[PDB]
Design a protein around this ligand. Structure first.
Ligand SMILES: NC[C@@H]1O[C@H](O[C@H]2[C@@H](O)[C@H](O[C@@H]3[C@@H](O)[C@H](N)C[C@H](N)[C@H]3O[C@H]3O[C@H](CN)[C@@H](O)[C@H](O)[C@H]3N)O[C@@H]2CO)[C@H](N)[C@@H](O)[C@@H]1O
Ligand SMILES: NC[C@@H]1O[C@H](O[C@H]2[C@@H](O)[C@H](O[C@@H]3[C@@H](O)[C@H](N)C[C@H](N)[C@H]3O[C@H]3O[C@H](CN)[C@@H](O)[C@H](O)[C@H]3N)O[C@@H]2CO)[C@H](N)[C@@H](O)[C@@H]1O
Ligand SMILES: [Mg+2]
Lengths: 253, 252
């Protein structure tokens, strides 16, 4: 196994078409729709991209996947009932900017009646409060946790974890920016490039991303200073935008 | 301006306050309360957070409370016994990172040996379950990462390569952890502990040195080291019998 190999958009779409025909042969009238997502769904696949497909099933509670390789390429096909998929499309977790681009990159190849459009409409109709709640949770569950981790590094090591942690913090900041602007990143490779192009960023985020994007992550004292500056920027930014809960009680339940 | 420095004694006082609040609020629905993470191992450092797990009698109970006081952070998970036991027996690609929880339980309340049952379930997973998880990890994570860095080589962007190299090093550490059936003690020690294990895929140690040193700016070298690690994976699976099925064009 030395793949993935170089492939063209034909070669991927021919494979997609074979999988579509197999899906219709096996599941028949239980298939409501078949779509391609990811880079191939956006028609921006590169020489080595994988193949990602989504199937909407009429079957109650249907929820399964097939993910395999031929040694030369890799495919993932998800099969979901309409209710299960629409519920997922309306959920906003901390990595929503990374996961839900799927629903804004659908290439419809089979649809028995407006199913893929309903998925898209569901993904785009999330209410403002849902994003607000997700942002407040991200600050506590990810950023505050990371701040404790790098401050532990400062006082007790290990600095060998600091480059990886700095990458994680830059990614969490990108999730924060994506939730705030209600944008999903096109690919994993463009997350940081797209994040630093947005407006109204927390102070210090650009400098942090400069280390991560250049790969100059060996000066631990500079990384710690950059992380602290970003953490200070988070405090001013969340206060300015109202992403604040009462934290005065030791136990808030 | 937090998190602040705290002592283990201070953290345990907070834990016991939370224990009393859980018993006051949820009463006889509480089967057990435990501390996990660094505090559960009694190796918490100056800035560590507080992580607690509760076993509930309510069927389908699955919720959490996660908050900060500005100065420290607490996460409390509440699960029914079956939900927790089911999760404790599942081996996903990040099992070496997630299931250390079940080998770090400090019981602080237990009405019927429940936390011991959780530990026994986590430690009794069969060898085939790890074999399946390793084969899935190669297909679902490592093969995907290989396509991503090969795309970078031909079309960019190299600005993603440091982050991707960190991800690949972590995925390799998961592979090693699944093979040796070990859970890493802390998030910070994953890479240091992984490269000290036996049976490493060739090229993995060298790749990790870039990630641990933070020397991630030489893009040609990272790409060469990623390819060498990917080749090391192909031997490593053959040597240890983790054979991935590549015979079906469409496996359904
Ligand atoms: N399918 C719709 C919904 O998917 C959910 O699961 C989501 C998520 O956990 C799941 O993640 C799955 C894993 O599991 C599996 N072990 C490997 C697989 N590559 C990964 O796939 C996902 O993560 C990759 C990056 N890491 C992405 O590249 C990929 O596009 C994405 N589908 O993919 C789903 C998102 O597409 C739930 N299953 C359910 O709410 C419902 O079925
Ligand atoms: N609790 C037992 C089981 O946990 C599962 O979820 C697991 C996982 O998704 C979940 O992850 C949760 C997130 O969700 C939540 N939004 C933020 C929270 N800090 C994070 O916590 C987890 O990830 C952190 C590192 N990032 C770890 O430091 C932390 O110890 C760990 N509990 O924590 C659970 C493991 O403790 C399922 N909920 C369910 O099968 C059952 O409840
Ligand atoms: Mg946590």
């Amino acid at each position: 196994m030395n793949g993935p190999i170089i492939m063209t958009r034909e070669e991927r779409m021919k494979i997609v078409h074979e999988i579509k025909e197999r899906i219709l042969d096996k599941y028949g009238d239980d298939v409501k729709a078949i779509g391609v997502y990811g880079s191939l769904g956006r028609q921006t696949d590169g020489p080595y991209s994988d193949i990602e497909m989504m199937c909407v099933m009429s079957t109650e509670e249907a929820e399964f996947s097939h993910e395999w390789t031929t040694g030369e390429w890799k495919v993932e096909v998800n099969f979901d009932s309409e209710e299960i998929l629409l519920d997922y499309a309306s959920q906003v977790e901390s990595d929503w900017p990374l996961t839900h681009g799927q629903f804004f990159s659908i290439l419809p190849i089979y649809d028995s009646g407006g199913y893929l459009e309903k998925v898209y409409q569901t993904a785009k109709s999330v209410e403002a409060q849902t994003f607000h709640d997700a942002i407040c949770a991200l600050i506590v569950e990810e950023l505050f946790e990371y701040a404790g981790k790098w401050r532990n590094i400062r006082v007790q090591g290990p600095t060998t974890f600091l480059p990886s942690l700095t990458v994680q913090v830059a990614m969490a900041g990108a999730m924060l920016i994506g939730l705030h602007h209600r944008i999903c990143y096109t690919t994993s490779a463009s997350v940081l490039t797209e994040a630093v192009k947005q407006s109204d960023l927390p102070s210090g985020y650009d400098h942090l991303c400069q280390f991560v994007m250049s790969g100059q992550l060996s000066d631990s004292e500079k990384l710690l200073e950059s992380l602290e500056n970003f953490w200070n920027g988070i405090q001013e930014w969340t206060e300015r935008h109202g992403y604040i809960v009462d934290v005065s009680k030791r136990i808030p339940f």
